[PDB]
């Protein structure tokens, strides 16, 4: 079926996790190593609550497709930039880069999409590591993502649950938190779905533990005081303030950017025309297959414009990555132009 389709590219949906980059600026300033992990994890859980259940099925992005967007930080008077590019359609790998130098953090990663069909239920996995770096500290956080289990395609209630075991690891300080997304059992209950449980630990010693639901309250209890507290809850006041995202002017967008590329596919979905939504998709995929043939005909060499593969490590690296800490006497404004994230400085370095 294809009535299960969200009018957003996967590169677009991949940027949803940074609507609370407000938190990451705070974490960069937190001086206690333990409290930085708490605030990093609190940010991680902040990117799953808007997720809708059911039809949601981002577009499989096309090779060379690019999404580019921006967020505004009023309190720190700065901006968080996001750039993602589809580097391979076979395999379906999309790379992303996030940079906010004034607030002292950046993220990089690459995500491979693999699905498995159980008949009535579908499970799409996202495997890959995201590296959060605090520029001023030279301190990295490596984290993975869960997988989405979808039941009710053919018959039964249509649902989307999150499951898996995520590891958020910081080797510099020795801290880490292991999270476990728990799927509802056969019996089920009013609170069995979206259950999240985890534990914050240093080295191997467990400092504190987490319980709750990832779309609702999550509670932390200290393993030394056994006193419970609210670790994270998406309060409507917290929801009321999600950083405002700014996309590129449609007339200024390249033809292979996500919004311009999928416009006709998106319009069909929003118009509820199911038949013309599939046809418009086949136009893009048929062009991709034809552009893949044309490539093999004379020279099969596809240059990713904004990303490049490191042969030694096998990881995808943003061509224009910059990790130098913010220098107030030199750095003036971080900006982006044509997918290139830059900073205006009064001294070249």
Residue numbers in the entry: 426 to 774
The authors write:
Lipid transfer at membrane contact sites, such as the ER–plasma membrane contact site, is facilitated by oxysterol-binding protein (OSBP)-related proteins (ORPs). Most human ORP proteins contain an N-terminal pleckstrin homology (PH) domain and a C-terminal lipid transport domain. The PH domain recognizes and binds the target membrane, while the C-terminal transmembrane helix anchors ORP8 to the donor (ER) membrane. In the case of ORP8, the cargo lipid is phosphatidylserine (PS), which is synthesized in the ER but needs to be transported to the plasma membrane.
The structure was solved by molecular replacement using an AlphaFold model. The RMSD between the model and the refined crystal structure was 1.44 Å, and the structure fitted the 2mFo-DFc composite omit map well. The overall fold is reminiscent of a β-barrel composed of anti-parallel β-strands. Compared to the well-studied β-barrel structure, the GFP, the ORD8 domain is composed of more β-strands (19 in total), whereas GFP is composed of 11 β-strands. However, in the case of ORD8, in one side of this β-barrel, the β-strands are replaced by three α-helices. The fold is therefore actually a mixture of alpha and beta. This observation is consistent with the previously reported structures of ORP2 and ORP3 that exhibit similar fold with RMSDs at 5.27 Å and 5.32 Å, respectively. The structure also revealed a rather large cavity (its volume was estimated using spaceball to be approximately 1860 Å3) in the middle of the barrel. This cavity, consistently with the previously reported structure of Osh6, represents the lipid-binding site. The full-length (including the lid) ORD domain never produced any crystals.
